[PDB]
Write a protein that holds these residues in place. Structure first.
Motif, PDB file in Angstrom:
ATOM      1  N   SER A 166     -39.381  95.016  57.594  1.00  0.00           N
ATOM      2  CA  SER A 166     -40.478  95.618  58.331  1.00  0.00           C
ATOM      3  C   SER A 166     -40.615  97.086  57.972  1.00  0.00           C
ATOM      4  O   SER A 166     -41.656  97.690  58.201  1.00  0.00           O
ATOM      5  CB  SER A 166     -40.232  95.498  59.822  1.00  0.00           C
ATOM      6  OG  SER A 166     -39.060  96.201  60.163  1.00  0.00           O
ATOM      7  N   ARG A 167     -39.553  97.662  57.420  1.00  0.00           N
ATOM      8  CA  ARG A 167     -39.561  99.062  57.048  1.00  0.00           C
ATOM      9  C   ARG A 167     -39.755  99.198  55.552  1.00  0.00           C
ATOM     10  O   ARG A 167     -39.812 100.313  55.024  1.00  0.00           O
ATOM     11  CB  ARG A 167     -38.243  99.740  57.458  1.00  0.00           C
ATOM     12  CG  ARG A 167     -37.978  99.786  58.950  1.00  0.00           C
ATOM     13  CD  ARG A 167     -36.582 100.289  59.229  1.00  0.00           C
ATOM     14  NE  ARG A 167     -36.397 100.616  60.638  1.00  0.00           N
ATOM     15  CZ  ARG A 167     -36.307  99.715  61.615  1.00  0.00           C
ATOM     16  NH1 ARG A 167     -36.371  98.421  61.346  1.00  0.00           N
ATOM     17  NH2 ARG A 167     -36.142 100.111  62.870  1.00  0.00           N
ATOM     18  N   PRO A 217     -41.589 104.904  60.346  1.00  0.00           N
ATOM     19  CA  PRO A 217     -41.668 103.590  59.693  1.00  0.00           C
ATOM     20  C   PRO A 217     -41.306 102.366  60.539  1.00  0.00           C
ATOM     21  O   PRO A 217     -42.007 101.339  60.489  1.00  0.00           O
ATOM     22  CB  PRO A 217     -40.724 103.741  58.500  1.00  0.00           C
ATOM     23  CG  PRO A 217     -40.868 105.198  58.146  1.00  0.00           C
ATOM     24  CD  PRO A 217     -40.844 105.862  59.503  1.00  0.00           C
ATOM     25  N   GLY A 218     -40.219 102.432  61.296  1.00  0.00           N
ATOM     26  CA  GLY A 218     -39.886 101.257  62.074  1.00  0.00           C
ATOM     27  C   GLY A 218     -40.284 101.305  63.533  1.00  0.00           C
ATOM     28  O   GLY A 218     -40.058 100.349  64.258  1.00  0.00           O
ATOM     29  N   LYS A 270     -44.139  99.156  66.409  1.00  0.00           N
ATOM     30  CA  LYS A 270     -44.009  97.721  66.497  1.00  0.00           C
ATOM     31  C   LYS A 270     -45.350  97.061  66.768  1.00  0.00           C
ATOM     32  O   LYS A 270     -46.120  97.520  67.613  1.00  0.00           O
ATOM     33  CB  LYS A 270     -43.037  97.328  67.614  1.00  0.00           C
ATOM     34  CG  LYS A 270     -41.649  97.861  67.437  1.00  0.00           C
ATOM     35  CD  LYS A 270     -41.113  97.554  66.044  1.00  0.00           C
ATOM     36  CE  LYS A 270     -39.673  97.984  65.932  1.00  0.00           C
ATOM     37  NZ  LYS A 270     -39.093  97.653  64.639  1.00  0.00           N
ATOM     38  N   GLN A 300     -43.998  91.809  66.536  1.00  0.00           N
ATOM     39  CA  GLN A 300     -42.673  92.405  66.355  1.00  0.00           C
ATOM     40  C   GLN A 300     -42.024  92.780  67.702  1.00  0.00           C
ATOM     41  O   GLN A 300     -40.840  92.504  67.913  1.00  0.00           O
ATOM     42  CB  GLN A 300     -42.769  93.639  65.449  1.00  0.00           C
ATOM     43  CG  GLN A 300     -42.904  93.344  63.960  1.00  0.00           C
ATOM     44  CD  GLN A 300     -43.487  94.526  63.161  1.00  0.00           C
ATOM     45  OE1 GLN A 300     -43.534  94.484  61.931  1.00  0.00           O
ATOM     46  NE2 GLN A 300     -43.942  95.578  63.863  1.00  0.00           N
ATOM     47  N   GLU A 323     -38.604  91.693  69.441  1.00  0.00           N
ATOM     48  CA  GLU A 323     -37.583  92.627  69.889  1.00  0.00           C
ATOM     49  C   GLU A 323     -37.156  92.225  71.285  1.00  0.00           C
ATOM     50  O   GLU A 323     -35.974  92.195  71.596  1.00  0.00           O
ATOM     51  CB  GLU A 323     -38.141  94.041  69.924  1.00  0.00           C
ATOM     52  CG  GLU A 323     -38.395  94.643  68.566  1.00  0.00           C
ATOM     53  CD  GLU A 323     -37.116  95.070  67.883  1.00  0.00           C
ATOM     54  OE1 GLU A 323     -37.182  95.565  66.728  1.00  0.00           O
ATOM     55  OE2 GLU A 323     -36.039  94.906  68.512  1.00  0.00           O
ATOM     56  N   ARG A 355     -40.306 113.240  69.432  1.00  0.00           N
ATOM     57  CA  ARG A 355     -38.974 113.821  69.545  1.00  0.00           C
ATOM     58  C   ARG A 355     -38.646 113.888  71.031  1.00  0.00           C
ATOM     59  O   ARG A 355     -37.545 113.573  71.452  1.00  0.00           O
ATOM     60  CB  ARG A 355     -38.913 115.226  68.910  1.00  0.00           C
ATOM     61  CG  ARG A 355     -38.624 115.216  67.391  1.00  0.00           C
ATOM     62  CD  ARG A 355     -38.241 116.601  66.814  1.00  0.00           C
ATOM     63  NE  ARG A 355     -39.360 117.548  66.871  1.00  0.00           N
ATOM     64  CZ  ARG A 355     -40.462 117.472  66.118  1.00  0.00           C
ATOM     65  NH1 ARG A 355     -40.601 116.490  65.226  1.00  0.00           N
ATOM     66  NH2 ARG A 355     -41.444 118.366  66.269  1.00  0.00           N
ATOM     67  N   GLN A 401     -37.770 110.360  72.189  1.00  0.00           N
ATOM     68  CA  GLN A 401     -36.474 109.955  71.655  1.00  0.00           C
ATOM     69  C   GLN A 401     -35.286 110.622  72.393  1.00  0.00           C
ATOM     70  O   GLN A 401     -34.193 110.052  72.511  1.00  0.00           O
ATOM     71  CB  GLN A 401     -36.424 110.256  70.148  1.00  0.00           C
ATOM     72  CG  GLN A 401     -37.255 109.296  69.320  1.00  0.00           C
ATOM     73  CD  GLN A 401     -37.339 109.673  67.845  1.00  0.00           C
ATOM     74  OE1 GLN A 401     -37.230 108.813  66.980  1.00  0.00           O
ATOM     75  NE2 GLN A 401     -37.555 110.959  67.555  1.00  0.00           N
ATOM     76  N   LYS A 423     -32.545 108.668  75.959  1.00  0.00           N
ATOM     77  CA  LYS A 423     -31.102 108.741  76.146  1.00  0.00           C
ATOM     78  C   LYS A 423     -30.692 108.999  77.603  1.00  0.00           C
ATOM     79  O   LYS A 423     -29.521 108.839  77.951  1.00  0.00           O
ATOM     80  CB  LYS A 423     -30.514 109.835  75.247  1.00  0.00           C
ATOM     81  CG  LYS A 423     -30.828 109.663  73.758  1.00  0.00           C
ATOM     82  CD  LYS A 423     -30.282 108.346  73.224  1.00  0.00           C
ATOM     83  CE  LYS A 423     -30.642 108.150  71.761  1.00  0.00           C
ATOM     84  NZ  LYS A 423     -30.107 106.869  71.223  1.00  0.00           N
ATOM     85  N   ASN A 449     -27.792 102.918  79.602  1.00  0.00           N
ATOM     86  CA  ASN A 449     -27.732 102.186  78.349  1.00  0.00           C
ATOM     87  C   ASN A 449     -28.249 100.764  78.419  1.00  0.00           C
ATOM     88  O   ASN A 449     -27.830  99.986  79.271  1.00  0.00           O
ATOM     89  CB  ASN A 449     -26.299 102.174  77.820  1.00  0.00           C
ATOM     90  CG  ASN A 449     -25.691 103.564  77.759  1.00  0.00           C
ATOM     91  OD1 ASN A 449     -25.582 104.255  78.772  1.00  0.00           O
ATOM     92  ND2 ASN A 449     -25.291 103.981  76.564  1.00  0.00           N
TER      93      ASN A 449
END
Ligand code: ADX
Ligand code: ADX
Ligand code: CA
Ligand code: CA
Ligand code: CA
Ligand code: CA
Ligand code: CA
Ligand code: CA
Ligand code: MG
Ligand code: MG
Ligand code: NA
Ligand code: NA
Ligand code: NA
Ligand code: NA
Ligand code: NA
Ligand code: NA
Ligand code: NA
Ligand code: NA
Ligand code: NA
Ligand code: NA
Ligand code: NA
Ligand code: NA
Lengths: 510, 510
Positions: free
Chosen positions: A184-185, B169-170, B173, B177, B181, B239, B242, B246, B250
Motif C-alpha cells: 500500500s506504500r 504515504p501510508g 487509508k 483499507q 485495519e 504532527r 501524531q 500518544k 495504548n
C-alpha cells in the motif's frame, strides 16, 4: 521476494472453509488433546501464518535429522533450526501415525489439528552439539535438556486460529498483512532489522545507514515471543521501540512485532532469521556483530565468534534469495560525535567509546547516569522505569536454620528498623510455612519492590519454587550472603549487620 | 455499517483489470483532456475510493438539482453536498454528451476517464442560498463565485488511480483499507472524530468520553484536503495529531487522514461527514459544537447556530445508519481540574475557563504562554514552530509613491539599521520592477521570516499577486500603515518612525 520454497504457507487462509468443522473436531469428546507450551505457541503461530514457509507442521524425524546434520529439510530446502512438537513419554505412548490430535492454548482455545506422521525419541546430545554447538550453558541446550519433552511428534497441521494475544492487537502483522502494508506504500525494497534488546543511538544509526545503503525503507522487526533468559521484557521493549521509531525521518520506517521464539543460536539462527524475514516480505536483512548470539559462558568464552553469523549467512548468500546487509561493530566516536562501523575507523588516530550491555545493566542498577550520546533520553527513562535502581528494588532477608535467637523478635526488629528509613518501600514479615502457594509469591513481592523478612527457610525440595533474585540468607554458614558471627549473636548486632549489608548493596541510601 | 446506498463504490478495485486499458485511452492524442483543480482532486479521490458511495462520478443536472433543493440525490438517497466538475465556457463548449474526457493531475498523471452525461450552467445564486445559506462571506460561497467554473459536467467515472500524494504515504487509508485495519484488530465499534484544527485537551477528553459512552475504539480522522482559508496547514496539524495520539491509552485509537475538501457548510456538511465516515467503516460519529462551521461573518453574526448540525443530523437519524454521538460545549473547570460538557455543569455555581482560537492565535502571535491545562506542551511547541511569534516573523516595508526622499538612500538606511539589531532575521532591499515573477516572491520571504525593504509600490493591477500579511505601507496618505509627516521628512526621522512601528508590533524586541 518469493516466500521460501516459493509458496507462502498461510494455513489460516488455506483452511478458512474448514474452521467450523476443525473447531468441532478439537472440541469433540473422543479426541486426544495436547496443551501447547509457550515455546510451541510461538512456533505454531509462525507455522500457521506462513512465517516458517515451506513448513506446514512440526518436523518428522526425516526432516529433523536433515536439519540437524545438513541444515536442510530432507528435500534439500535450506532450513537451519529444527521446529518440533516436544512431548513426554506418557503422551507419546498414546499416539501412532494417522492419529489426529487437537492442540490447545491454555487448555481452552483450540489452535490446530495435527495429523501424526511419526513419534520418535531424538538424541538430545547430537541435537545439542550439531545445532547449538554443545555448550551446556547455551540457552537452547539448557532448554532442550531441562524443559523440552524427550519425544518429538512429527506431523501436518491444519489451522483453526493463531494463538491468542491481548497486547498490541494491531502490531503483530502476519506475513500476508505486512506485505499488504509495504505494498500500500509502494515499498518494493525493505531492509529488516532483527532485535531482542532495546535500541540505542548505535542501532538507530546502523538501521538508517542500511536504509541508505540498500535504498530501502526500514522495517524494525522485534521479537516478542521467547528470547534469551534475563532479557528486558517485551512490553518495556515495545515502548522503547515505539519511542525510537520517531527519531527516524517521517515515512522511512515501519514497526511490526514478531512472535518468534529465538534459540539464541548465533550463525544458524541468523540464516533462519533471514528466511523468516524473506517470508515476511523483506528484500534485505541486517546481520550485525554477534547476531543472535548469547554472549559468553561462565568461563568467559564466546558461544560464537563475533562474526560467525555473517560468515554463515554469506556462504548461503546465493540461495537465501534475500539481500544481507552486514555490519561490523558500529561504535561511537567522541571526537567527531558520530557513530560508525569499526571497520571504517581506528588504526588509532580516532578514539572510540562503547557501553556494553553489562555496563548498562549496572548503570541501571545503581541509578548512574547514561550518556546523551549513547541512547535517547526518553528511551533511558522507559528503561529506568521498568528496571529500577537498587533503592527502588525489592528484596528478602531469610532467617537461616542456624539462628538461635528469637525468630519472632529478630523479624520484628528488622521490620521496625527498615520502617524508620522510609523512601516508599513496603515491608512485611512473610511466613510461607513451606507452602508452594506462598513460596511462589516471594518473587512477586520483590518484583513489586517490597522488602520481605522471612522467619525461617523452606525445605530444599521446595527451593525451585522461589527465584533467588534479591533473596539473601542470614546465617552462620559460609554460604550465607550475610554471615553471622554466632548463632546467638544479639539482635541489635544482627540488625546492624543486615542494615549495612543492604546499604552496601544499594537497597538503602541515606 | 453497510456503505451508504448498499455498495462501497470502490472504483479503484472495480476497475483494476482495466487500468492498462484506461491508461492507454487517457494518453491518446485524440481524447479531450481536463486538468483537475485542487478541490476536484480532493473530490475525485473520495469518489474513486468509495468514500462518497453511492456516487460513481460527478453529479448530472438531475442529481445536482435534487441535492441543492432537496438534500437528496434524484433517487431519494440522502445526500447534502453537491459534488460537481466545474469547467470554463471554453472547455464546456467542446464537450458533448456520450463523450469521454480524460481527467489528469498536474497535467501529467492520468486519474480517470469521465463519460459525459451533460454540461450545464448552474444558477450559482440558488446553490449559494440553498446549500450554503447565502452569506457572501461564507467560504463555500466565495469559492463558488470566485474560483469554481461556471459550467458543470455530470458523468460517470472509470478509475485509473487515486490522486498522487508523496507526504504521509501510508496514512491516507481508503475505506477498504481502514475497514481492513479495523478487522485485523477485531474492532467492531469505532467512533470517528472529524477535525480540521489542532487537537487540545478538550478534544482528547471528548473523544475518550465518546469512546466510553459508545463502547467503541477511537478513530482520529482529520481532513488533509481543503479546509477553511486560514487554518493551520495540514502538515503541522498532522504532527499535532501524531503527538496527541500518544496521550490516549495504548491501543484505543487509530489515526487515518481524510483527503476531503470541506465546504464549511455546517449542518449540511455534518450529515455529509456522517455518510462519509459510515462509508469508511465507523459505527459512530461525533458531532460537537458548530460542527464544520465557519464562525461569524463581518457583522459578527453566526453562519450557523452552534447546534444546527446536531439538529439536522438528529432529524436524519433513521436514515444515516451510523450512530451520532453529540456533545455540548466541552469546557475546562479550573477548580476541579477536568473537562466536561457544559450541559452537565454550570448551575452558575461552577467556574469554567476557555481559550478561543482567536485568543490562541494571539498568544502564538506574541509568544504568550499557553496554559498547561489547555493543551499538551509537545502540541504547543509544534504550533509555535509553525506559527512563530512576531520577533521571529518576516515582514515588508514599502516606500510609498508619495515619498520624495531618496528611495535608494532611505532603503539603505533602513537596511543598515535593521542589521544593527540582529536576532537572526535576514534582510533584503527588494526591487520587483512590477514583474509578477518577482512580486509573487514577496510572501515567500515573509514566509521565510525575512524583512523586505521595497523602494516603491507595484501597479494596482498587481496587488492580487501579492499577499497582505506583514506588508506595511510607508506613506503620507491616510491608507499608510506607518504615516509620514511629509514626503520630504528627513531620513533619520523616517527610520525612527519605522523602527518604532515594528517594535510596537513585536517584530523587534530589545
Ligand atoms: N553495536 C552494534 N554493531 C553492529 N551490530 C549491532 C550492534 N548492536 C546490535 N547489533 C545488531 O543488531 C541486531 C539485533 O541486536 P540485538 O537485539 O542486541 O541482538 S539479537 O540477538 O536480536 O541479534 C543484530 O543484527 C546485531 O548483530
Ligand atoms: N470544545 C468543544 N466542545 C464540543 N465539541 C467540540 C469542541 N471543539 C471542537 N468540537 C467538535 O470537534 C469536531 C472538529 O472540530 P474542529 O476541527 O474545530 O472543526 S470542524 O470544522 O471539523 O467541525 C467537531 O465535531 C466540533 O463540533
Ligand atoms: Ca528428559
Ligand atoms: Ca569475543
Ligand atoms: Ca554465645
Ligand atoms: Ca463566473
Ligand atoms: Ca454564537
Ligand atoms: Ca519640505
Ligand atoms: Mg497471536
Ligand atoms: Mg491520494
Ligand atoms: Na524472489
Ligand atoms: Na482452565
Ligand atoms: Na568461527
Ligand atoms: Na535464487
Ligand atoms: Na543489491
Ligand atoms: Na562491599
Ligand atoms: Na507540466
Ligand atoms: Na434569491
Ligand atoms: Na448505541
Ligand atoms: Na439555527
Ligand atoms: Na444498519
Ligand atoms: Na501600540
Amino acid at each position: 521476494p518469493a516466500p521460501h520454497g516459493g509458496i507462502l504457507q498461510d494455513l489460516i487462509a488455506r483452511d478458512a472453509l474448514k474452521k467450523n468443522e476443525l473447531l468441532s473436531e478439537a472440541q469433540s469428546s473422543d479426541i486426544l488433546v495436547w496443551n501447547l507450551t509457550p515455546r510451541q505457541l510461538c512456533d505454531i503461530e509462525l507455522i500457521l501464518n506462513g512465517g516458517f514457509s515451506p513448513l506446514t507442521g512440526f518436523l518428522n524425524e526425516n526432516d529433523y535429522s536433515s536439519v540437524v546434520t545438513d541444515s536442510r529439510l530432507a528435500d534439500g530446502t535450506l532450513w537451519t533450526i529444527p521446529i518440533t512438537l516436544d512431548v513426554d513419554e506418557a503422551f507419546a505412548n498414546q499416539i501412532k501415525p494417522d492419529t489426529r490430535i487437537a492442540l490447545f492454548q491454555d487448555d481452552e482455545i483450540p489452535i490446530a489439528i495435527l495429523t501424526v506422521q511419526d513419534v520418535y525419541k531424538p538424541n538430545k546430545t547430537i541435537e545439542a552439539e550439531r545445532v547449538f554447538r554443545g555448550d551446556p550453558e547455551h540457552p537452547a541446550i539448557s532448554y532442550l535438556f531441562n524443559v523440552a519433552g524427550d519425544y518429538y511428534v512429527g506431523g501436518s497441521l491444519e489451522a483453526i486460529q493463531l494463538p491468542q494475544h491481548y497486547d498490541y492487537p494491531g502490531l503483530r502483522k502476519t506475513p500476508a498483512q505486512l506485505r499488504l502494508e509495504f505494498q500500500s506504500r509502494q515499498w518494493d525494497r525493505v531492509v529488516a532489522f532483527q532485535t531482542r534488546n532495546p535500541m540505542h543511538r548505535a542501532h538507530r544509526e546502523l538501521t538508517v545507514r542500511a536504509a541508505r545503503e540498500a535504498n530501502a525503507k526500514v522495517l524494525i522487526h522485534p521479537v516478542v515471543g521467547l528470547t534469551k533468559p534475563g532479557d528486558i521484557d517485551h512490553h518495556t521493549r515495545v515502548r522503547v521501540y515505539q519511542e525510537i521509531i520517531k527519531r527516524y525521518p517521517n515515512g522511512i520506517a515501519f514497526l511490526s512485532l514478531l512472535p518468534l521464539a529465538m534459540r539464541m543460536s548465533g550463525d544458524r539462527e541468523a540464516v533462519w532469521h533471514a528466511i523468516i524475514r524473506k517470508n515476511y516480505g523483506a528484500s534485505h536483512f541486517i546481520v550485525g556483530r554477534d547476531h543472535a548470539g548469547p554472549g559468553k559462558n561462565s568461563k568467559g568464552v564466546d558461544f560464537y565468534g563475533p562474526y560467525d553469523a555473517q560468515e554463515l549467512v554469506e556462504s548461503y548468500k546465493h540461495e537465501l534469495d534475500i539481500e544481507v546487509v552486514p555490519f561490523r561493530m558500529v561504535t561511537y566516536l567522541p571526537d567527531e560525535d558520530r557513530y560508525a562501523p569499526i571497520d571504517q575507523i581506528d588504526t588509532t588516530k580516532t578514539r572510540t567509546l562503547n557501553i556494553s550491555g553489562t555496563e548498562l545493566r549496572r548503570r541501571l542498577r545503581v541509578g548512574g547516569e547514561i550518556p546523551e550520546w549513547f541512547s535517547y533520553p526518553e528511551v533511558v527513562k522507559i528503561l529506568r522505569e521498568s528496571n529500577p535502581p537498587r533503592p527502588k528494588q525489592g528484596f528478602s532477608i531469610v532467617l537461616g536454620n542456624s539462628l538461635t535467637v528469637s525468630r519472632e523478635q529478630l523479624s520484628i526488629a528488622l521490620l521496625s528498623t527498615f520502617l524508620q528509613f522510609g523512601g516508599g518501600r513496603y515491608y512485611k514479615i512473610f511466613e510461607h510455612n513451606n507452602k508452594t502457594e506462598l513460596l511462589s509469591l516471594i518473587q512477586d513481592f520483590i518484583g513489586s519492590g517490597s522488602g520481605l523478612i522471612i522467619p525461617d527457610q523452606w525445605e530444599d525440595d521446595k527451593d525451585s519454587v522461589v527465584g533467588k533474585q534479591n533473596v539473601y540468607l542470614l546465617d552462620t554458614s559460609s554460604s550465607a550472603d550475610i554471615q553471622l558471627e554466632s548463632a546467638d549473636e544479639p539482635i541489635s548486632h544482627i540488625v546492624q549487620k543486615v542494615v549495612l549489608f543492604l546499604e552496601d548493596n544499594g537497597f538503602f541510601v541515606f
